[PDB]
Design a protein around this ligand. Structure first.
Ligand SMILES: CC(C)CCC[C@@H](C)[C@H]1CC[C@H]2[C@@H]3CC=C4C[C@@H](O)CC[C@]4(C)[C@H]3CC[C@]12C
Ligand SMILES: CC(C)CCC[C@@H](C)[C@H]1CC[C@H]2[C@@H]3CC=C4C[C@@H](O)CC[C@]4(C)[C@H]3CC[C@]12C
Ligand SMILES: CC(C)CCC[C@@H](C)[C@H]1CC[C@H]2[C@@H]3CC=C4C[C@@H](O)CC[C@]4(C)[C@H]3CC[C@]12C
Ligand SMILES: CC(C)CCC[C@@H](C)[C@H]1CC[C@H]2[C@@H]3CC=C4C[C@@H](O)CC[C@]4(C)[C@H]3CC[C@]12C
Ligand SMILES: CC(C)CCC[C@@H](C)[C@H]1CC[C@H]2[C@@H]3CC=C4C[C@@H](O)CC[C@]4(C)[C@H]3CC[C@]12C
Ligand SMILES: [Mg+2]
Ligand SMILES: [Mg+2]
Lengths: 228, 145, 211, 96, 48, 145
């Protein structure tokens, strides 16, 4: 249904589909997703400010989930979304199909990290971009969800274990891709590690890895070479 | 400033890790030290009012006797035993148990606890050496930043 | 079972079976001396849940100790499980085995400190007040040893435990020393022999504190 | 041990001892009250029994699958299959 | 971005190749192939 | 001339390898020794002009106290404490902290650093025993040539 807020109404169809995946997963008994959104203490747009009809029927929108994941990573996570590029007026642009793919992939990637479905997460991680940074983000979200207040409970134990396992695996992926980069061209790998990314308030990948407490990434020879 | 060096830095991380084993040794050692100290101080100076000197006597000699400094000449002097053989020909027969108590105490602390601490240190070292190197590599960035 | 549903696994481990005179599976495993079953995380989770009683598992040593020392100031401001509620919270907190363990620890620590002070300070010409308090405390300890002895699974199981043996040595040492002093309270030699026995008493009492 | 032990500490555990002794005297001699307990229902018992039997079957299926994914068993099964494969070539060659 | 994406694809191809050269995977693939081989003898014997 | 022998030669190669661990121990030990020595020398003799004797006092007793020789009778004599209990009834109350400082110091050096050195020696020995045998076999040709 149509909403008076212009931000929610601007959202494309696939965002509503991801919202439908969150809703159906949330309606299942003892689901950690519904409990996580209730304990988040945020509004419909995900802002930490604490009508009623809008807050339950559209409680699993992508912007609100982005805000929850944003608080979960660090103090400076801020995904810049641009849903205006899916309009037909941007079709003449050459690289637009990649960005639309990458952005879409990212949103689905985050959803797959939230439900702890590793294979589908790895697949969405491969299609999109910013592979190293996304793997670090995946490791950080799974470790923080695994020690969050919303995941304590008798039925979530195996799930929690799975999260730490998956976290370690994503950390390995981030190391592996990094290693491949350092094997191919060390200067470009150093330039890549020194590159400031807009998604974490303009600071580099090693700083992101340190904030994500990724010991394996920091102990890697490529990262140590850049630090030296 | 030792942390930049590849030898001194992991050893310092290792030292903070071994502090828990040192604390474990202190908690186990505290039991024998307080027990032997109360028993030994009471046997050496009976019929005396409790004071701060009694507490200092409980703590002073039992702690320093685990490092090999045996106060046996001083203990012998305090026991008022006048014989050529040390804990013989004493005024009270109860004070002659002070070497026996001491013999059990340093058997408990030096033979058992110190060697147990050596075993915990060796095991702990083998367990956390690679983790110390990794943690040193994270602290390399911390110092650089 | 623990992989599929932890609560049903806990309920299964807590279920009394008629074939072993109405007692649970962990007790059966302990009687069968199955170390692998007892060391399993599911069994340990049930044992920890039994340890904390009707309290949250995130409670630390200091929190329960502070609540023990300050009952009316820390218990309403904690989350777990107005005479209907305060009485319910008091009966749940103080029926927990962890709280009883902490009470026994604190009690044995005071016993060690008070008895240590008694041995270090000089004996008087009559039986002192602290001596009478220690006499009441060790009779009570002796009665507690008799009470555990009667309601356990036999004399062999009780005497098998090293801490029960240490308890018998403490009670025996204190009573010999006390009767040695009480036989002739004004005799200096009796006081010296009594303190000599009580040196052994303080050594066993602190050794017993490692439990 | 600390489930069955009285709550009250050692100087004050005498009160707990005389209270239990008083209760024991009132059960053997007075008999003016009794003991109450709770007995588990047959429904929850059959639920636990069904759960335990189902998980027994699940562990055995998982255990059989895990032993068949082991390297020695896979090499052995491959070996027996290659033996059955020659039996089939003997049949094919005979028919030719 | 192009460099990082290219090396991501290269590590995944190398990773897949490394897991297929492992002993367990090779034994498993050999096992499934021998199962497919009997399927083919069943077809050959039926035709005979 | 021990290097020809199959027992003494790899052990000598092993001794030079363990010299780095000894040096690491010296660098870690130097921190506590200088800190405790400056603190202890200042507490024992206050209101005194700095001289060469002050430096010798900083270095002499803290180094030899890690080998178990406790200078407590000598420390007690220098502290001017006249009581039967040793660090009681002193002229200044500050000098009574000298056993406490000492207690922390030998806990840092003997309990922690010496046992840490034992762990480093055991690990180092297991790591470089085969390399020591190989290096001894190269030194066999060196001696032959
Ligand atoms: C398990 C432990 C407690 C073993 C027990 C051994 C104890 C009780 C023994 C060992 C050495 C003994 C002492 C040896 C010598 C003497 C001198 C004698 O003129 C009076 C008794 C006295 C002072 C003994 C008292 C008892 C004693 C302390
Ligand atoms: C192999 C080792 C453990 C042997 C054990 C040594 C024991 C049995 C020895 C070593 C030192 C001894 C004590 C030395 C001095 C005295 C004082 C004397 O007036 C009574 C006996 C007494 C108290 C001795 C009792 C026995 C003793 C404790
Ligand atoms: C099992 C252990 C803990 C108990 C050891 C027994 C102790 C309490 C008993 C056994 C023998 C006793 C000693 C026997 C003889 C004497 C000589 C007397 O002139 C003074 C007391 C003294 C020195 C006794 C002190 C207490 C003593 C050491
Ligand atoms: C973490 C470390 C520093 C623990 C701190 C404990 C220190 C500060 C304590 C432990 C022993 C203490 C000393 C014990 C006894 C005395 C005698 C008194 O008449 C004056 C203070 C003085 C000299 C104390 C000073 C403070 C002291 C040195
Ligand atoms: C298990 C082990 C670590 C117990 C620790 C022992 C500590 C607490 C003991 C051992 C030796 C003790 C010191 C011995 C002597 C003196 C001199 C006195 O005038 C003030 C207290 C002071 C300075 C003591 C302070 C406490 C002390 C440092
Ligand atoms: Mg990609
Ligand atoms: Mg008992």
């Amino acid at each position: 249904a149509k909403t008076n807020i212009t931000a929610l109404d601007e959202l494309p169809s696939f965002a509503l589909a991801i919202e439908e995946l969150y809703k159906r997963e949330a309606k299942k008994p003892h689901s950690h997703v519904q409990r996580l959104v209730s304990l988040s203490n945020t509004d419909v747009l995900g802002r930490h400010y604490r009508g009623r009809d809008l807050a339950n029927t559209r409680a699993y929108n992508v912007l609100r989930m982005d805000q929850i994941f944003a608080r979960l990573v660090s103090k400076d996570f801020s995904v810049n979304r641009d849903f205006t590029i899916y309009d037909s007026k941007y079709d003449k642009v050459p690289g637009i199909q990649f960005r639309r793919t990458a952005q879409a992939s990212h949103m689905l990637f985050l959803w797959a990290i939230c439900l702890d479905r590793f294979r589908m997460a790895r697949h969405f991680w491969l299609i999109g971009d910013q592979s190293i940074i996304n793997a670090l983000v995946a490791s950080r979200i799974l470790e923080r969800l695994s020690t969050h207040r919303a995941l304590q409970g008798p039925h979530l134990a195996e799930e929690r274990a799975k999260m730490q396992h998956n976290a370690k695996k994503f950390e390995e992926l981030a190391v592996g891709v990094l290693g491949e980069c350092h094997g191919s061209d060390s200067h470009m790998a150093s330039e890549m590690l020194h590159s400031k990314n807009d998604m974490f308030n303009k600071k580099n990948a090693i700083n992101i890895a340190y904030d994500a407490k990724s010991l394996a990434f920091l102990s890697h020879p490529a990262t140590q070479s850049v630090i030296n | 400033y030792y942390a930049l060096s590849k030898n001194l830095g992991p050893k310092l991380i290792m030292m903070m890790e071994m502090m828990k084993d040192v604390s474990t040794f202190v908690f186990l050692l505290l039991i024998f030290l307080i027990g032997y100290g109360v028993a030994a101080q009471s046997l050496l100076s009976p019929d005396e009012d409790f004071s701060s000197r009694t507490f200092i006597g409980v703590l002073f000699r039992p702690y320093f006797q685990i490092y090999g400094e045996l106060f046996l000449d001083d203990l012998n002097s305090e026991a008022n035993c006048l014989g050529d053989t040390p804990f013989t020909e004493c005024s009270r027969e109860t004070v002659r148990m002070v070497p026996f108590f001491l013999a059990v105490y340093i058997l408990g602390s030096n033979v058992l606890l110190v060697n147990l601490l050596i075993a915990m240190f060796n095991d702990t070292y083998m367990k956390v050496q690679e983790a110390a190197e990794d943690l040193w590599r994270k602290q390399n960035y911390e110092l650089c930043a | 079972c623990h992989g599929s549903d932890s609560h049903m696994a806990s309920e299964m481990l807590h279920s009394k079976n008629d074939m072993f005179n109405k007692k649970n599976a962990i007790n059966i495993a302990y009687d069968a001396k199955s170390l692998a079953f007892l060391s399993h995380p599911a069994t340990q989770s049930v044992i920890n849940a039994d340890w904390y009683g009707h309290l949250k598992s995130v409670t630390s040593f200091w929190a329960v100790l502070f609540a023990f020392f300050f009952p009316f100031f820390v218990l309403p401001f904690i989350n777990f499980s107005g005479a209907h509620r305060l009485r319910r919270k008091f009966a749940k907190f103080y029926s927990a085995p962890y709280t009883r363990f902490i009470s026994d620890l604190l009690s044995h620590f005071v016993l060690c400190v008070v008895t240590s002070y008694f041995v270090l300070d000089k004996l008087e010409d009559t039986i002192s007040a602290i001596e009478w308090i220690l006499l009441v405390w060790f009779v009570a300890l002796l009665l507690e040893e008799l009470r555990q002895m009667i309601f356990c699974d036999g004399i062999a199981e009780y005497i098998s435990d090293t801490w029960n043996r240490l308890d018998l040595i403490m009670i025996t040492l204190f009573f010999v020393g006390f009767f040695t002093h009480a036989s002739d309270p004004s005799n200096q030699d009796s006081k010296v022999v009594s303190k000599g026995i009580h040196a052994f008493l303080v050594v066993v009492l602190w050794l017993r504190f490692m439990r | 041990e600390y489930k069955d032990r009285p709550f009250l500490p050692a100087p004050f555990i005498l009160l707990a001892h005389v209270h239990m002794l008083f209760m024991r005297l009132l059960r053997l001699c007075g008999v003016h009250t009794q003991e109450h307990e709770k007995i588990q229902d047959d429904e929850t018992k059959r639920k636990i029994t069904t759960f335990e039997e189902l998980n027994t079957d699940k562990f055995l299926r998982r255990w059989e699958r895990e032993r068949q994914e082991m390297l020695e068993a896979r090499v052995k099964m491959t070996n027996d299959n290659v033996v059955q494969a020659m039996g089939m070539m003997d049949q094919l060659l005979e028919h030719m």
